[PDB]
A paper describes a structure:
The regulation of cell–cell junctions during epidermal morphogenesis ensures tissue integrity, a process regulated by α-catenin. This cytoskeletal protein connects the cadherin complex to filamentous actin at cell–cell junctions. In contrast to mammalian α-catenin that functions as a dimer or monomer, the α-catenin ortholog from C. elegans, HMP1 for humpback, is a monomer. α-Catenin is a flexible all-helical protein comprised of an amino-terminal domain that is connected to its middle and amino-terminal F-actin binding domain (FABD). The FABD is a five-helix bundle.
We eventually overcame the challenges that bundling posed for cryoEM structure determination by first applying F-actin on our cryoEM grid, followed by adding HMP1/α-catenin versus using both proteins simultaneously on our cryoEM grid. This process eventually succeeded in our 3.4 Å cryoEM structure determination of HMP1/α-catenin bound to F-actin. As seen for the binding of mammalian α-catenin, the carboxy terminus of HMP1/α-catenin extends to engage in hydrophobic interactions with HMP1/α-catenin of a neighboring HMP1/α-catenin. For example, Val-809 of one HMP1/α-catenin interacts with Ile-872 of a separate HMP1/α-catenin polypeptide chain. Specifically, Trp-711 predicted to be at the end of the first α-helix in the unbound HMP1/α-catenin FABD structure, that is also seen in our unbound human α-catenin structure, is instead at the carboxy terminus of the second α-helix in our F-actin bound HMP1/α-catenin structure. When bound to F-actin, Trp-711 fills the pocket that Trp-861 occupies in the unbound model. The extension of the second α-helix, by borrowing residues from the loop region, no longer leaves room for the loop region of the last α-helix that therefore becomes disordered in the actin-bound HMP1/α-catenin structure. A S823F mutant has previously been shown to reduce the binding of HMP1/α-catenin with F-actin. This is consistent with our actin-bound HMP1/α-catenin structure where the hydroxyl of the HMP1/α-catenin residue Ser-823 is within 4 Å to the amide of the F-actin residue Arg-147. Given that carboxy-terminal truncations prevent bundling, it seems that the last ∼20 residues are responsible for bundling.
Residue numbers in the entry:
A (entry chain E), C (entry chain F): 5 to 374
B (entry chain L), D (entry chain Z), E (entry chain K): 690 to 699, 710 to 810, 817 to 850, 861 to 874
F (entry chain D): 188 to 374
C-alpha cells in the first residue's frame, strides 16, 4: 500500500503518507492529565488528553513530554501518542501501512529495540524502518554532499556526508536544543519580574521564544545597543490580558546555542561543533562540506541564525574556502520531507523490516537492517 | 464544527447513517440559533429558541442511545473509553437543556436575547461533544476488529 | 567604622553590627495603620505604627507586610521599616556605617537597583553590599561545601556550593514559604469551626503554627494515628480566653512543603527540589553535596523536619551515598551570622560599593559588584 | 558535460537514438537553468525553474527505463554493473527532483534565487549521472557480444 | 595531614621554626578534637572543643602573619601566588572559627556532639590550608633567589 | 571510543571530568579478547561477561560488550575511522623492513612498553596475531614485564647514571654558543 512517515520528534509529532510533500498531522508530543478536582458529574471521565486536546485544556492539566532528549523516557505515554497519531489524527489502520520512524544518532539501542517491538506487537504494522534524522534532512535538501546541522527540541546533532557515504566517526551529538532554551528563557525572564513556573507557563514561554527571540550577529554590540536605547524592546500579551516586555532577553536566549556556558554546559557552541565535525573528516572532502551546511530542525529558525553561523564558521575555516549555510524556508519539516522521499523510493522497498523477519530474529533485527 | 461533519462521505454502516443524520440536524438547528444571535435567522422569538433547544436535546438523547449501542458492540480500546466519556458529557448537556428550557419558558411566560444566550451556549457545548462522539464511534467500530477523508496537508510555511 | 548587617527578610527584620554573634533588633516587618475612628483628642496623631509597636496595637490596625515573596512591593513602607531599624531600634546614624543587605536569589533586578538607590540617596550610607542569603548561611554554617536549603517567610531556595564555587545553573527558587503555610493553616482551621479572617488573626494563626505545628515522619501513618485516637490533640488559648483544639491540623500545615499540591501549587516538594538541585551539579561533587545539606531560615524549624527530609532524600539518592541534614539549633539566625562573618572580614573591605562608585556609575553598579 | 554527449556521432542502434535525444534535451534544459543562475536565460521565474526541473525528472524516468532495457539485453560484464549503479543513482535523483519541486512550488505559492539553487544542484547531479549512463550502456551493448569518436591525444608537455 | 609536617627536619631559617612550631601545635589540637569525635581524648566537654577551636584560630592568625612576612620577602613566582591564595583561605577560616565558636558557646550556655561537628570541620579545613602554606612558604623562600626530605619512591606495581 | 560506545547502553559522559571517569572505567574493566568473533558470540549469548562499576555519585553502570571492544581499536583502527593497520601488522611491517639477517632476532624480542599495553590479555593476543603473519618456523615471543608502565623511566635512570654518558649532556655553554639547534646535533 502507501507507507506512513511518522517523525516523532522530541517536541512535535509530524506524521503523513509517503510520497506527499507535507504532513497531515502536526501536533505537540504531550500527554496531559487533570490535576484539580472534578465537581460536575460526567465531566472528568477522560483520564488523559493527548496532543492538541491537551494544549487547549492546559489550564487544568500537567503536560508531560514522553520523549526527553530524543530518548523515550515514558513508554505508556508514547504508546498513547502513537495510538493518537495512527487512529485519531491520520485515521488509518496501522495493519495496512508500513511505518518509517525517525531517530537521532547515538541514542541507546534499547530505544530502537522497543520502538520496533511496540510497532510489531501492539500496532501490528506489516513493515517498518528507523532512519537517522540528518540523513533524511540531506535527502530533502536535494543534495548528497553536506554536513547536516539538525537542531530540534531534544538534541542537536551533525552528520557529515560525502556523496552518499556518511562518516560515522565525525557525528557530533550535542544535547542542547529548544527545550533548554525555553528553560533558560524562563530563568532570564525572572529578572524582569515575570515568574512562569508551571508546565502551561512553560508553553507560554515557548510561544514567547518563538514569536520574539532572535539571534544577534554580534553579541557584544547588540548588548551595548540594548543597554543604550530601548529600540529593541518588544511586547507580548499573555493569555489573561497582561502585557510583558522583553528587550535584552530576545537574543540572550538563543545565544545559549553558540555559548553553551550560559546554562552551565561545558561543550562548545554549534559553530565550533560543526567546524570540529568538518575537520574530523578526510582532507579531500572538507572543501565540499564547507560549502553545503544544511540546517534543519525547528530550533534553527531563529531570525538571523544563518548569517551568524556563517560569520562564526568563516572565522574558523581557512580564508580561502567558501562557506555558505543552506537554510531552506521549510527547514522545520525537512526531516519529514526526507522521510517522504526515502519511503516512496523504488529502490527502498527491499529494505523494510518485514514482520516475518521480526518473527524470525526478534527485536534485534533493527540493528542489522538499520 | 460543521466542517468536522462535512468530511463524512457516503456497528457502523448499519447505524452510521442515523447518527450522521442526527448530527447534521443538530448542526442545522445550531446555526439556526447562531443566526438568531446575529439577528437574522429562521427563528426570531425566544419561544422559538426554547423549542429549538428542546429539539436539540431530543436529538442528543437519540444519538446517545445509538452511540452507546455502537460502544458496547465494539471491543476494548482507548477510543472506546473516549467515546464513553463523550457519552457522559452528552447526558449532562441534555439534562441541562431540558431543565433550563423549561425554566426559561416559565420565566418568559410570567413576563430577551440574554434569556436565549445560555440556551445557545449549552446547545453549542452539546454540539461540540457530538462531533467528537461520531468520530470516536466511527473509529471504534471501523478501524478496530460512511467514511472520513484523510486530513488535509499542513502548511509548510505559516505567515 | 563598624559595619551594619541588616537582614531584611520577608517576615522579620534582623539587624545588628558586623563582628557580633547575635542581632540587636529583631522585630516583625509590618506597618500598621489605624482603621477605626479616633474619639479622644491627642490620641490618633500617629498615622502608622512600624514593627513591634504595630504588633502590640494590632487590635485597631491593618498590618501590611511591605516585602512579599522576597520582593519589596511597597517602597514607602519599606523606607519606614529601614528608618525604624536604623534610628529607633539600632540607634545609629547611617551616615557612619556601611550596610550589608541580604536578598534571595533570582529576584528582579529593579529590587537591587532600588535598594541601592534608597540607601545611597535617602540614608546616605558610605558603602553597601547585597549578598545572597544562602551564601551567608553557608558562611555561618562553618563550611565551604554544601547545598543550602533556606526556607523563610517569603521564598524557599537552594544554592549548591562546592569549595567556594557556587553553581548558578542549579539554584532552585521555590515560592512556597512560611506565609503560605500560615494561610493554609487558616484554611484548614476553618474545618474545626474557628474562623480567623483579619490580619491580627493572621498573626494569631502564625503563633499557633509556631507553637503547635510539627512535621510528620510518615504522613499516612500519622493520619491513621490521629484518626484512631485523640493522643495528638493539643490546645491553644486565644488572646480573649477562648481555647481551641487542633489535632489533625498540626502536621497537615507543614506537609505543604513536601506536597505543594495541598495549596494548589504544581511544583515538587522541598525534598525533590533539593535532590533535583543536587543532580544538576557535576557528577564528582554530588557525594560532597549529599553529606552537607545545610538547612536555614525560620520555616525549617518545625519539630521533625530534619529526620523527615533525610528520610525523603535517602529514598531518592543511591543506596551507597551518605545523606545527613545539618540543622544547627540557631538556624533561624544563620543568614545574619553569615552576614557578620562576611562583613567583618579583612579580605572583604575592598568589595563594598562605595558612594563615589555609585555617583560615577549609578544604581546599576550593584549588578557588577554583587 | 555537454562535450561528453557532443562526441556522439550518427540494444544500441535500435533504442540508442531515443537515449541520445533524451540526454540532449536534458543538457539543453540544464544550461537553461544554468543561464537562469547567471542571470540571463530563456526562463526567468522560479516557477519556470520548477517546471524545468519536473521536465528533467520526467526525461530521467524515460531514460532510466530505456537504459534498463539495454542493460538486461546485454551480457554479464563490469560495464553492466557500472550501468546498474548509475541507474540506481538516476532513480534517487528523479525522486528527489519530483518531491523537492512540489515542495518549492508550495513554498513559493504561500508567499528567490536560493529557492532554485537546490533544484539546479539536483538536476546537475542527475545530468552528471546520465552522461555516464549513455556511455556505459553504449559500451555494454556494442563492444561486448551512433558512435563515439576516439579520445583526443593527451598533451606531451603541460604548461 | 600530620605526615606532611612530619617530613620537616631540622625568610626561612629565621622565621621557619616559629611557623613549623605553630603548625605542629595546630595538628596536636586537631587530633585532640578528632579523638573527641572518636570518643576518647584529652578534652571531653563541648566547652573544651570550643576553647580548642579558638586556640586554633589564634594560631592561624599568628601563622598567617608570619607567612605574609615571608611572602613579601620573597620574589615574584608561581609559588608566591599559591602562598597568597592559601593565606586568604586561612583568613576566611579563622574568621569563621572565631564567630562560630562564640555562637556555639552562647547556644550551649542558653541550654551535643553535633554542636562540635562543625567546629571540627572548620578547624580541619584550616589545618589542610596550613600544611600547604608551610610548604609553599618554604619553597618560595628557599628554592628561589629546616628541610623537607625528597618524596618516597612510587610503587612500580599497585595491587 | 569508550565514551562513544558507552552512549549505546544509555550512559552519556560528556565533560572532561567525565572523560577521567571513563578513563578509570577503561583501566579497571576493559581487556583484550584473544579471538574477537568468539568473544562477541559469547557476550551476546550469555551475560557472563558483564561487570559493574560504581560512579562517583553512587550510580552503578554495567558494561558487558564494551569491555573488549574498546581495546580492539588497537588491532582494528578502522573502528575509530583510521585507515592504518593494527599494532600487530605495524610491528610485523617494521620487522620486515629491517635487514634479513636480524629478523629472527627481532621476532624473539618484542619488548612492549607504555601504559596502554597493560590490558589483560594483550601479550597473548599480539603473539597470536604476529605468529599468523611470521613464517611458521620462527619463534615469536612477546616480552611484557610487569612494570612496563615505568619502563621508559627506568631506562632513563639507566642511561642518565652511566659513566660513559656524562660526556653527552648538552651543557649550558654549548647552548650559549650554538643556540637551541644544538639538540639536533647532540641527540
Ligand atoms: N519559529 C521558531 N523560532 C524559534 N524556535 C522555534 C520556532 N519553531 C519551533 N521552534 C523550537 O523548535 C522546537 C520544535 O522543533 P521540532 O521541529 O519539533 O523538532 P523535533 O521534531 O525534532 O522535536 C520547539 O520546541 C521550539 O522551541
Ligand atoms: N519555631 C518555629 N516553628 C515553625 N515555624 C516558624 C518558627 N519560627 C518562625 N517560623 C516561621 O518562619 C517565619 C520567619 O522566618 P524568618 O527567619 O523571618 O525568615 P526571613 O527572615 O527570610 O523572613 C515566620 O513567618 C514563621 O511562619
Ligand atoms: Mg527534528
Ligand atoms: Mg531568611
Ligand atoms: Mg610512555
Amino acid at each position: 500500500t502507501t507507507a506512513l512517515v511518522c517523525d516523532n520528534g522530541s517536541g512535535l509529532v509530524k506524521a503523513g503518507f509517503a510520497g506527499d510533500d507535507a504532513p497531515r498531522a502536526v501536533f505537540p508530543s504531550i500527554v496531559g492529565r487533570p490535576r484539580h478536582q472534578g465537581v460536575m458529574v460526567g465531566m472528568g471521565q477522560k483520564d488523559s488528553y493527548v496532543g492538541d486536546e491537551a494544549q487547549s485544556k492546559r489550564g487544568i492539566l500537567t503536560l508531560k513530554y514522553p520523549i526527553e532528549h530524543g530518548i523515550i523516557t515514558n513508554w505508556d505515554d508514547m504508546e498513547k501518542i502513537w495510538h493518537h497519531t495512527f487512529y485519531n489524527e491520520l485515521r488509518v489502520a496501522p495493519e495496512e501501512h508500513p511505518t518509517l520512524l525517525t531517530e537521532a544518532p547515538l541514542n541507546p539501542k534499547a530505544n530502537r529495540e522497543k520502538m520496533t517491538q511496540i510497532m510489531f506487537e501492539t500496532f501490528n504494522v506489516p513493515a517498518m524502518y528507523v532512519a537517522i534524522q540528518a540523513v533524511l534532512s540531506l535527502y530533502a535538501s536535494g543534495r548528497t554532499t553536506g554536513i547536516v546541522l539538525d537542531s530540534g527540541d531534544g538534541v542537536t546533532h551533525n552528520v557529515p556526508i560525502y556523496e552518499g557515504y556518511a562518516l560515522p566517526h565525525a557525528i557530533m551529538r550535542l544535547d542542547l536544543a529548544g527545550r533548554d532554551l525555553t528553560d533558560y528563557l524562563m530563568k532570564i525572564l525572572t529578572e524582569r519580574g515575570y515568574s512562569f513556573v508551571t508546565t502551561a507557563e512553560r508553553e507560554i514561554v515557548r510561544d514567547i521564544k518563538e514569536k520574539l527571540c532572535y539571534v544577534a550577529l554580534d553579541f557584544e554590540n547588540e548588548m551595548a545597543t540594548a543597554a543604550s536605547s530601548s529600540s529593541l524592546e518588544k511586547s507580548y500579551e499573555l493569555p489573561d490580558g497582561q502585557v510583558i516586555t522583553i528587550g535584552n532577553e530576545r537574543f540572550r536566549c538563543p545565544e545559549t546555542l553558540f555559548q553553551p556556558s550560559f546554562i552551565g554546559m561545558e561543550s562548545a557552541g554549534i559553530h565550533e561543533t560543526t567546524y570540529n565535525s568538518i575537520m574530523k573528516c578526510d582532507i579531500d572532502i572538507r572543501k565540499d562540506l564547507y560549502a553545503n551546511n544544511v540546517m534543519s530542525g525547528g530550533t534553527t529558525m531563529y531570525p538571523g541564525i544563518a548569517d551568524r553561523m556563517q560569520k562564526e564558521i568563516t572565522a574558523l575555516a581557512p580564508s580561502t574556502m567558501k562557506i555558505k549555510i543552506i537554510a531552506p524556508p521549510e527547514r522545520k519539516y525537512s526531516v519529514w520531507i526526507g522521510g517522504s522521499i526515502l519511503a516512496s523510493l523504488s529502490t527502498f522497498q527491499q529494505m523494510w523490516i518485514t514482520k516475518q523477519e521480526y518473527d524470525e530474529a526478534g527485536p534485534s533485527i533493527v540493528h542489522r537492517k538499520c | 464544527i460543521q466542517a468536522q461533519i462535512d468530511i463524512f462521505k457516503v456497528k457502523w454502516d448499519e447505524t452510521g447513517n442515523d447518527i450522521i443524520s442526527l448530527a447534521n440536524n443538530m448542526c442545522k438547528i445550531m446555526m439556526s440559533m447562531t443566526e438568531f444571535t446575529r439577528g437574522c435567522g429562521p427563528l426570531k422569538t425566544t419561544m422559538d429558541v426554547i423549542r429549538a433547544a428542546q429539539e436539540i436535546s431530543l436529538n442528543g438523547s437519540k444519538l446517545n442511545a445509538l452511540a452507546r449501542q455502537i460502544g458496547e458492540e465494539s471491543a476494548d480500546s482507548q477510543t472506546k473509553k473516549d467515546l464513553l466519556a463523550y457519552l457522559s458529557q452528552i447526558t449532562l448537556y441534555c439534562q441541562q437543556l431540558n431543565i433550563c428550557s423549561k425554566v426559561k419558558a416559565d420565566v418568559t411566560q410570567v413576563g430577551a436575547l440574554d434569556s436565549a444566550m445560555s440556551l445557545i451556549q449549552t446547545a453549542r457545548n452539546l454540539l461540540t461533544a457530538v462531533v467528537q462522539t461520531v468520530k470516536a464511534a466511527y473509529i471504534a467500530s471501523t478501524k478496530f476488529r460512511w467514511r472520513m477523508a484523510p486530513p488535509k496537508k499542513q502548511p509548510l510555511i505559516r505567515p
